[PDB]
C-alpha cells in the first residue's frame, strides 16, 4: 500500500475492507454541524516528562517515537475516559501549500497535520489497545504556512539523516510542548487509524487553532524519500488520505 496512483488510497481496501467500514478517518468538519456540548471537559496534556528516544523513515512518514513504559507523557480531559500514553507523533504533508492536512475544516486543506498517537493504559499495550473501541486518542493539529515554529527545527534538522526507507537516528530530550497551539479549543468524534490497517479505534480529538511554520520548515519535509536507499528516488509527499463519509456519526465542539 502506498499513496501512488496503483497502491493510493482508493485502492486500500482490496487488502483492508475496514477501508469503508462505518467510523473511517479523516472526516471533514462541517463547523455549522458540529455540535456544542456543554458536558465536555478541558483537554490534560501532562508532556513535561515526556522521553523521544528516536525518529525513523518507514516509507509512508516520519515517526518520532516516545518511551511509553511509564506514564510521563499522557493525554487525559476532555471526552477520554481514563489515561492515555503517547507512543509517537507523525505528520502529513502535500507537495504544495494548498494541501497536506488528512482532517479539513469546511472543505479547507492545512499545508499539513501533525498527530500525536496515544494509547489507553488500561488495555496494557499498544497492540491490546488497537483491539478496542476506546483504544486511542488522536491529538490532530493543523500547520499553516506563515512563521517559523522554533520548536519544529530540532525535527527539521535531523531528515537529512533518515531520508530513506528504514533509516532512525537516535533522538533524545525532544519536547513536545512545542509544538502546542496556545488554546486547546477541539471538536471530537469516533473514527479510525488513516493508514492501514485502519483499524476503528480512535477518539478523534481535532484542534481548532492551527500552528504556524516557515516555508523552509515545510520544504525540509519534502525532501524525504518514499523509497529505500539505493533504489530510484520516490519524494515523500502527498502521504495524506481523503475525507471519509461521515456516516451518521456526529462531530462535537468543546466551544
Ligand atoms: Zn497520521
Known amino acids: 500500500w502506498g499513496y501512488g496512483k496503483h497502491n493510493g488510497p482508493e485502492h486500500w481496501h482490496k487488502d483492508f475492507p475496514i477501508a469503508k467500514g462505518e467510523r473511517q478517518s479523516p472526516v471533514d468538519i462541517d463547523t455549522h454541524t ?4 456543554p458536558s465536555l471537559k478541558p483537554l490534560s496534556v501532562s508532556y513535561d516528562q515526556a522521553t523521544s ?16 513504559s511509564q506514564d510521563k507523557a499522557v493525554l487525559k480531559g476532555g471526552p477520554l ?6 507512543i509517537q507523533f507523525h505528520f502529513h504533508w502535500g507537495s504544495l501549500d494548498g494541501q497536506g492536512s488528512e482532517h479539513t475544516v469546511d472543505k479547507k486543506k492545512y499545508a499539513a497535520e501533525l498527530d500525536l498517537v496515544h494509547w489507553n493504559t488500561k488495555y496494557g499495550d499498544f497492540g491490546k489497545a488497537v483491539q478496542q ?7 490532530g493539529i493543523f500547520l499553516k504556512v506563515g512563521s517559523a515554529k522554533p520548536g519544529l527545527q530540532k525535527v527539521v534538522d535531523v531528515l537529512d539523516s533518515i531520508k530513506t526507507k528504514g533509516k532512525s537516528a537516535d533522538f533524545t530530550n525532544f519536547d513536545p510542548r512545542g509544538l502546542l497551539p496556545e488554546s486547546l ?15 476503528e479505534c480512535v477518539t478523534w480529538i481535532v484542534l481548532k487553532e492551527p500552528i504556524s511554520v516557515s516555508s523552509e520548515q515545510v520544504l525540509k519535509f519534502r525532501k524525504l524519500n518514499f523509497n529505500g536507499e539505493g533504489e530510484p528516488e520516490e519524494l515523500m509527499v502527498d502521504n495524506w488520505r481523503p475525507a471519509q463519509p ?10
Open 246 to 255: 461521515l456516516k451518521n456519526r456526529q462531530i462535537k465542539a468543546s466551544f
Open 81 to 86: 475516559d481514563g489515561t492515555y500514553r503517547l
Open 34 to 37: 458540529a455540535k456544542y456540548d
Open 53 to 68: 528516544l528516536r525518529i525513523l523513515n518507514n516509507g509512508h512518514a516520519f515517526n518520532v517515537e516516545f518511551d511509553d
Open 133 to 139: 473501541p476506546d483504544g486511542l486518542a488522536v491529538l
Open 185 to 199: 479549543d477541539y471538536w471530537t468524534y469516533p473514527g479510525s487509524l488513516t493508514t492501514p490497517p485502519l483499524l
